[PDB]
Amino acid sequence: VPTQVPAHIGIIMDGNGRWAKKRMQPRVFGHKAGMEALQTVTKAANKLGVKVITVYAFSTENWTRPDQEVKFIMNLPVEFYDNYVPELHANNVKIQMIGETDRLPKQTFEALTKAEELTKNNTGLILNFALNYGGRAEITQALKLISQDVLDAKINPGDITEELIGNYLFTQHLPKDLRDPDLIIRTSGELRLSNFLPWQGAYSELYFTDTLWPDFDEAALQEAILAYNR
Amino acid sequence: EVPTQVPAHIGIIMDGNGRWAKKRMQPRVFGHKAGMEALQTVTKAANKLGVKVITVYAFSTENWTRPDQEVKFIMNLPVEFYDNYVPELHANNVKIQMIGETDRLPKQTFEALTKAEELTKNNTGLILNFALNYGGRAEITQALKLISQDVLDAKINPGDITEELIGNYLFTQHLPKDLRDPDLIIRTSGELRLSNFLPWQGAYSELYFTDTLWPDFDEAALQEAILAYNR
Numbered sequence A: 001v002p003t004q005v006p007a008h009i010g011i012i013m014d015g016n017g018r019w020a021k022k023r024m025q026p027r028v029f030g031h032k033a034g035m036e037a038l039q040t041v042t043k044a045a046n047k048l049g050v051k052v053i054t055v056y057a058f059s060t061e062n063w064t065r066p067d068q069e070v071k072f073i074m075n076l077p078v079e080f081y082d083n084y085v086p087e088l089h090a091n092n093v094k095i096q097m098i099g100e101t102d103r104l105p106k107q108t109f110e111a112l113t114k115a116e117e118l119t120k121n122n123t124g125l126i127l128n129f130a131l132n133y134g135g136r137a138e139i140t141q142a143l144k145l146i147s148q149d150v151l152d153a154k155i156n157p158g159d160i161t162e163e164l165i166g167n168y169l170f171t172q173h174l175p176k177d178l179r180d181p182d183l184i185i186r187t188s189g190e191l192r193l194s195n196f197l198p199w200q201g202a203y204s205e206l207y208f209t210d211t212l213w214p215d216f217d218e219a220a221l222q223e224a225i226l227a228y229n230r
Numbered sequence B: 001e002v003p004t005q006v007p008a009h010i011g012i013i014m015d016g017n018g019r020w021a022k023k024r025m026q027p028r029v030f031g032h033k034a035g036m037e038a039l040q041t042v043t044k045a046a047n048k049l050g051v052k053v054i055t056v057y058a059f060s061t062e063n064w065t066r067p068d069q070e071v072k073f074i075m076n077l078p079v080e081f082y083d084n085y086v087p088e089l090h091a092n093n094v095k096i097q098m099i100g101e102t103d104r105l106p107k108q109t110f111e112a113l114t115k116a117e118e119l120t121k122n123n124t125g126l127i128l129n130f131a132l133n134y135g136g137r138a139e140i141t142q143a144l145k146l147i148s149q150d151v152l153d154a155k156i157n158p159g160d161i162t163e164e165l166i167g168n169y170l171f172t173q174h175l176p177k178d179l180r181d182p183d184l185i186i187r188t189s190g191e192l193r194l195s196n197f198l199p200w201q202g203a204y205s206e207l208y209f210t211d212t213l214w215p216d217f218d219e220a221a222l223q224e225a226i227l228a229y230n231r
C-alpha cells in the first residue's frame, strides 16, 4: 500500500481441467468454475481501478479439443449473459470481445453481442473477451486489410508504421493509451506465451503463479498487482 | 540417469551487464565486455549440448537513447569479437549471422559483423544469431510493408497472405523453417518483461527467468535452463 496498479491486465486462464480433475469432478465442470472465478476477478479488478481486462477465452488452437468440451465451453457465454452479465452490468462493467467471430456458434455469438449491447454505455472496467483469438492470426488479418487498403490507394505503403498496424488489430477499439496490456497474468505454473497478444504485449510485465485459475480470487489478483513493480 | 529434452532454438535476453559491473566496482561499460565474454561460454556450451540456433538480443532500437559513450563502447564490441572471439567460434564450427536493421549501424561494426559472417558461412554447427538494431514490432512492420509492396506489384495476391507467408519476410526467414521459432527464451537478471524480442517467432516459446546476471550466466546456468525446459 500503495502499489502501482496495471491499467490493462491480460489473463491466461489455465487449470480448469486440473482444478476439476483434482476434485474428482468432470473436466468441463472446471471451465464453469473458471467462469465463476472470472466474475470474482473481474469485480475485484474493477474495485482497484483497472481499466481493461483481456482474458484469453477460446484460442484458435482450441477447436481441436473433443467436440463435447467445445460444445460445453461455447455454451458458457450463454449462461454468462443470462446469469452473470446482470451483475457486471450492475457494477458498470463494459463487455467487449476481440477475436474471430465468423466461426462461432450462433447461440454463443448472440449472447456475446447482447452482452455488449447491454453494457455499451457503461463507463467502468472493460472486460475484453478474447474468443476464437490467435495473435499470429490477428496480425495476418491486419496485414491483409492493410494490403487491401494499399491496393485501393487509401494508404500508400509508406503510410505503414507501428502506429498504423496498431489501428488495425482487434484491440483497435480500445482507447490508444490502453490498447497494450501493462500486465499479463498466467496461472497454473505454465511459462509459455501461447500466442496471446503477441503484438500488444510486446513490452508487458509477466506474472506467473501456480494457483489454478478457478482458485484465482481477489486475494490472488492482489498478490499479482502488488508484484507488478515497474 | 535420463535424458532431458533440449531446445533446438534458444532466444536469450542478456540483462544485468550494468548491475554486474556496479556490483563489482567496475565501470558500467566493462560489464558489457563481460557480457560478451559470457556469450562465448554460453555459445560454446550450447554447441556442446547440440542446440541448433541461439538468438541473443544484443542491441534493441530503444537502446540508442543511452549515452553516446555507452553506445560507442557497445558498438566497438563486435570489432573485438571479430578479432578476439570469432576465430574460436569458427574453430568450434559456429555459424555467425545477424538480424536487425543494419543500415543504421557504424561502419567498423557492420564490417566486423559481415566479415564474421563471411568467415563462418560454411560452418555447420550451432548458429549464433546476433539481434542488433532489432525490434519485434519494427521487424513485423518491415515484413508487413514489403508484402504490401509485393501485393501492389501483383507478385502475391492478397489471397496468398497467410501466417506461413508473413514468417518468410521476418528477419528470421534465413533460418531453416523448423528452426525459425525459438523453443526457449531465457531472460536473466530477474526481469519478467518481454521487451519486444521476437514477438512473432516466440509466440509459443517456453520462458525461463533467472535472477542470475548475464555476465555470470555460464555452462552451468545454461544447463539449469535446458533442464527446466520440460516440454
Ligand SMILES: CC(C)=CCC/C(C)=C/CC/C(C)=C/COP(=O)(O)OP(=O)(O)O
Pocket: A013, A014, A015, A016, A017, A018, A019, A031, A034, A035, A038, A056, A057, A058, A059, A062, A073, A076, A077, A080, A129, A131, A188
Ligand atoms: C467466454 C466466457 C464466458 C468465458 C468464461 C470462462 C471460460 C469459458 C474459460 C475457459 C477457458 C479455457 C478454454 C481454459 C482451458 O483451460 P485448460 O483445460 O487448459 O486447464 P488445464 O491446463 O487444467 O487442462
Ligand SMILES: CC(C)=CCC/C(C)=C/CC/C(C)=C/COP(=O)(O)OP(=O)(O)O
Pocket: B014, B015, B016, B017, B018, B019, B031, B032, B033, B035, B036, B039, B057, B058, B059, B063, B074, B077, B078, B081, B130, B189, B191
Ligand atoms: C558481439 C556483440 C554484439 C557483443 C555484445 C555483447 C553484449 C555487451 C551484450 C549486452 C547488450 C546490452 C545492451 C546489455 C545492457 O544490459 P543492461 O544491464 O543495461 O539491462 P536492462 O535493459 O535490464 O537495464
